[PDB]
Amino acid sequence: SLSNKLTLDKLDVKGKRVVMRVDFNVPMKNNQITNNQRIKAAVPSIKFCLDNGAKSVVLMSHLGRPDGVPMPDKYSLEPVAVELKSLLGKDVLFLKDCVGPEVEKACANPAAGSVILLENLRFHVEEEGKGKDASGNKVKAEPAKIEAFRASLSKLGDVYVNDAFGTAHRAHSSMVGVNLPQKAGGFLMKKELNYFAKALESPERPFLAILGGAKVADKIQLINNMLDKVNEMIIGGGMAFTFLKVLNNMEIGTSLFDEEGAKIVKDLMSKAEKNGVKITLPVDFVTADKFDENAKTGQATVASGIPAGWMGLDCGPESSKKYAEAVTRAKQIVWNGPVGVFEWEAFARGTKALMDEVVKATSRGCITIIGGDKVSHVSTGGGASLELLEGKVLPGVDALSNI
């Protein structure tokens, strides 16, 4: 819903300084970006600004959850700066803080065409407006300090842009408290909301949802809301053992069992049933002797049970084939969460096999949407997508200027 908000295509940025909230919270290992998808997604708004005559583009984001303590040794945005520079073909001035004297001066009037990335916002308790101390307790933020944090951010540009879709569910100071006459939705913000609004309000049918993940209790709302829209639905990952234990009394050994979500499984199945949704659960498995990448692997079916002391970490071949048949009937697919422990090659086969079917479906004309160009749309969303789909309002979209 961006018919009534100001958006970038209309903002005149010529000779103007631009502050842009983006989502550069990327997955990392050992100070190394493991996935630069969130960085690439931000490129077209940045380019447009630079191309249209921007004095400067100042970029701000969080990374991980450092809970209002500075952690530049574990959670620094510096690695992103180096990545952004290559992608952009431009120099990137990395600043080691996000508010204050040094930052405001550095951004006061940069050389024409400067791209500037600030340090992790969540190094300041005032970004969330709450935090944890070094003894792990409930530290309250100070209103006067929040007003100062925000007022410092409002200095780094003449105009504001939110291209931060992956964070749009967060009412944080960088997301709703920036004070400037013009607050615009960037091109990503627009692309994301257009794909998910078309997918949900004029779906191509048959419409398939694939939902995977570890726990059930936290997806009740998602599943319910999806169950009113979709023609089919796959339920996969460690969340399916809860389902199979209740609907089939499968012996799951040490596989994950959501004791709470177990009590409403019945109601989900009942609403699916009355709505005519076909529920596709896994029927076989790759089992492991412990929660380890280098565990000993086995195999099991619903008929056979998983032996005791062993746990299920990936669906198997016959489950793969079942998933594929739903993929074949679909004209639209929304996929959220893995069907197994794809992190680990031994347990990655189900997700790979499945990605292939979804890719092949795209070639025939299926609209395929996956969570954060072989598919229609790879979302940066993940957690914000889930809230989009639970029907809830996005603090990041609501705070943009009205026309």
Ligand X SMILES: Nc1ccn([C@H]2O[C@@H](COP(=O)(O)OP(=O)(O)O)[C@H](O)[C@@H]2O)c(=O)n1
Pair of tokens at residue 257: 């069992």
313 binds ligand X (CB under 6 A): yes
Kindly state the DSSP code that residue 238 receives in the 8-state scheme. Answer: T
Of 333-352, binders to ligand X (CB under 6 A) are 337-338, 340-343
388/382 Cα distance (integer angstroms): 10
172 is in an annotated binding site: no
Q: Does 177 bind ligand X (CB under 6 A)?
A: no
Backbone phi and psi for residue 61, each to the nearest 5 degrees, phi listed first: -160, 170
Residue 316 assigned ligand-binding role:
no
Query: Could you identify the residue written with the tokens 């970490």?
Result: 313
Ligand-binding annotation for 213, yes or no, is yes
CB of 71 to ligand X, least distance (A): 23
Cis geometry, peptide bond prior to residue 395 (ω within 30 degrees of 0): no
Q: DSSP labels for 331-369?
A: SEEEEES-SS-TTSGGG-HHHHHHHHHHHHHHHTT-EEE
Q: How many residues bind ligand X (CB under 6 A)?
A: 14
* Most distant CA atoms of the chain, gap in Å: 69
CA–CA separation, 107 and 100 (whole Å): 11
Given the complex with ligand X, which of 186 and 371 has the nearer CB atom? 371
Q: Does 218 bind Mg ion (CB under 5 A)?
A: yes
Selected from 214, 247, 279, 359, the binder of ligand X by CB under 6 A is 214
Q: How far is CA 303 from CA 242, 250, 286, 307, 318, in A?
A: 16, 8, 14, 12, 13
Instruction: Choose the binding region for Mg ion from 20-28, 156-164, 183-191, 215-223 (rule: CB under 5 A).
Output: 215-223
Q: Which stretch binds ligand X (CB under 6 A): 137-145, 152-160, 208-216, 295-303?
A: 208-216
Q: Which helix (H) or strand (E) holds 185?
A: strand 183-185
Would you say 312 is a known binding-site residue?
Answer: yes
Read out DSSP for 152-184?
A: HHHHS-SEEEE--GGGTT---HHHH----S-EE
Q: Tell me: does residue 215 bind ligand X (CB under 6 A).
A: yes
Give the bridge partners for 378, in sequence order.
370
* Span near ligand X by CB under 6 A; candidates 96-104, 106-114, 211-219, 391-399: 211-219
Region from 123-131, 165-173, 213-221, 268-276 binding Mg ion, contact rule CB under 5 A: 213-221
Instruction: Determine contact, residues 14/157, Cβ cutoff 8 Å.
Output: no
Minimum distance of ligand X from residue 9's CB (angstroms): 32
185 counts as binding ligand X under rule CB under 6 A: no
The answer to the question of residue 166 lying near ligand X (CB under 6 A) is no
User: Which of ligand X, Mg ion, none is residue 261 near (CB under 5 to 8 Å by kind)?
Assistant: none
Q: Is 244 in the site for ligand X (CB under 6 A)?
A: no
Q: Phi, psi at residue 104, to the nearest 5°?
A: -70, -45
CB of 212 to Mg ion, least distance (A): 11
Residue 126 contacts residue 141 (beta carbons within 8 Å) = yes
Cα within 13 Å of Cα(60), Cβ side:
29
Instruction: Report the alpha-carbon distance of residue 106 to residue 396 in Å, rounded.
Output: 26
**Host H or E run for residue 281:** none
- Closer by beta carbon to Mg ion, 218 or else 356: 218
- Comparing CA positions, the residue from 303, 376, 383, 297 lying closest to residue 337 is 383
**Residue 218 annotated as binding site:** yes
Q: Is 253 in the site for ligand X (CB under 6 A)?
A: no
Q: How many positions of this chain bind Mg ion (CB under 5 A)?
A: 1
Residue number with CB closer to ligand X (157 or 381): 381
**118 torsion bin: left (phi>0), alpha (psi -120 to 50), beta (else):** beta
121 marked as binding residue: yes
Q: Which residues are annotated as a binding site for ATP?
A: 214, 219, 238, 312, 343
Q: Which residues are annotated as a binding site for (2R)-3-phosphoglycerate?
A: 22-25, 37-38, 61-62, 64-65, 121-122, 169-170
Q: Which residues are annotated as a binding site?
A: 22-25, 37-38, 61-62, 64-65, 121-122, 169-170, 213-215, 217-219, 237-238, 312, 337, 339, 342-343
Q: Which residues bind ligand X (CB under 6 A)?
A: 212-215, 237-238, 256, 313, 337-338, 340-343
Q: Which residues bind Mg ion (CB under 5 A)?
A: 218
